[PDB]
Amino acid sequence: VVTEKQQMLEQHLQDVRKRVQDLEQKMKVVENLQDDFDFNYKTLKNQSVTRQKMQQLEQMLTALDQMRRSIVSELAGLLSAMEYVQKTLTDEELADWKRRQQIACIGGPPNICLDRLENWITSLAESQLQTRQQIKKLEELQQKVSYKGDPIVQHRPMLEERIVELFRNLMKSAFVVERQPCMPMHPDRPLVIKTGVQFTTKVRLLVKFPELNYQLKIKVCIDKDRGSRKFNILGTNTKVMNMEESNNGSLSAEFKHLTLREQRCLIVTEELHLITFETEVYHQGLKIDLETHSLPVVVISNICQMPNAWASILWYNMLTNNPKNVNFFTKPPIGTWDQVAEVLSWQFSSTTKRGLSIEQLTTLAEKLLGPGVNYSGCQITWAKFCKENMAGKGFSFWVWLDNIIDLVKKYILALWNEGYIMGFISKERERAILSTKPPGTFLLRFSESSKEGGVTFTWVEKDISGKTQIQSVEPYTKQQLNNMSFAEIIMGYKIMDATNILVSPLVYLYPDIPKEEAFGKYC
């Protein structure tokens, strides 16, 4: 859906194009008048005929001055308009995309489409090129015909400085990282790169100029620049930018043959690195030095470091919009619960068909902050999330959660995707909602004491005394889920009753779904 700010920008660019086109027509008229003045001056060098020709030349030069004074001020007004629209385009519309990319990287909505910004940037770039050519024409015209108090000699140096500044800054802003450094075997985990592993990245120039096809050589490097590890990019670290049908005519450069190796003559998962891209543009007498960099990258040595490395990327991209804060973990910022809850639900909605529900997020809030009702005014630190182990446990909240995400993705995906997994429910709440329900009613949830991840089912029944009993089964491990599906385990589960007969204590899946109707399709 196109916004009000974006529709106003589309008209503001169209108005710039109309102004540029209107000045082109004035430039033609001023050139033809000067060419006539130049011709008539150089030629015919009663006696009244010479006097009449002299009056013609004076009138033509006075008219030349007025047309020049008009064009110069019309160009000054055009540049001011260009400056405003460029600030809206680069500092506002482009920055929003950069933030939308940070969010998409960490599982957020996958918007981040360049086609509209490429169309707007190209339009502004083409308009600025015609303006630069009009300022070049004023220089050419002045050289041939000038006079004391000529508006070209006094205002052209400022007009030239203004358009050159505009065009350089637009070219520099258009050089973006379309696809952030990522390992192809871990597409759901970008900005985490293991040494010796082939990784890919992609860059794009949003100024759609066909002149530049096969002209820009993109050089890629790491650690360009206290006590931090230094690395080198090995493989094919140079790529010629080209227009493809696959890109829809867009100028881009994809690096697929890259690897990191430590250079040879703070904790590893919190150390950040920047992958830099460089090129030089030579366009009609201008040398524009383009330089862009990736979002901070965590460099790992073993794949066991992947969970803590991903948490550092989650923290960085959730809390800051700054694209180069390498010292972020020297003093990491605090997050709100609503910020964290959004990211945690993104971890599930990017890997599965279902994110985290309100009830699942509430029980997750209580696990980190303790009892309460409203968690919107609560704060979560890096220590409570990843750096330090949970209160009374030998593992951090993130390690416990990452093992659940993996359990869902690899072992119980189909059940999670259909909504048969209660997942996160406190011992007090599960006993509460089951207390009212008939005997044999059960819910599926994850283990809180299991580091590696465990799945369980909590059920309700009545003893001979009539007292309601709520029990959970010993959590089923990943190893067990590799032999039997959780659905087969639910159906096959038997208990020894009072009559000493093996019976299934499971009848209905919460709230009232008969077990065979919900889990039969998976056996």
Ligand SMILES: CC(=O)N1CC[C@H]2CC[C@@H](C(=O)N[C@@H](CCC(N)=O)C(=O)NC(c3ccccc3)c3ccccc3)N2C(=O)[C@@H](NC(=O)c2cc3cc(C(F)(F)P(=O)(O)O)ccc3[nH]2)C1
């Ligand atoms: C007390 C009771 O009424 N129960 C029945 C009896 C006991 C004893 C046997 C055990 C059981 O049913 N085991 C399962 C296998 C479970 C597994 N993880 O592999 C089972 O099917 N047992 C069979 C059997 C038969 C042959 C060979 C092996 C096992 C069985 C069947 C019939 C009779 C006996 C045994 N069986 C149980 O799990 C009983 N419950 C527990 O022991 C238990 C629940 C629980 C919950 C958590 C948590 F919520 F996730 P957290 O957030 O981490 O705190 C953590 C630890 C936990 N332990 C349920």
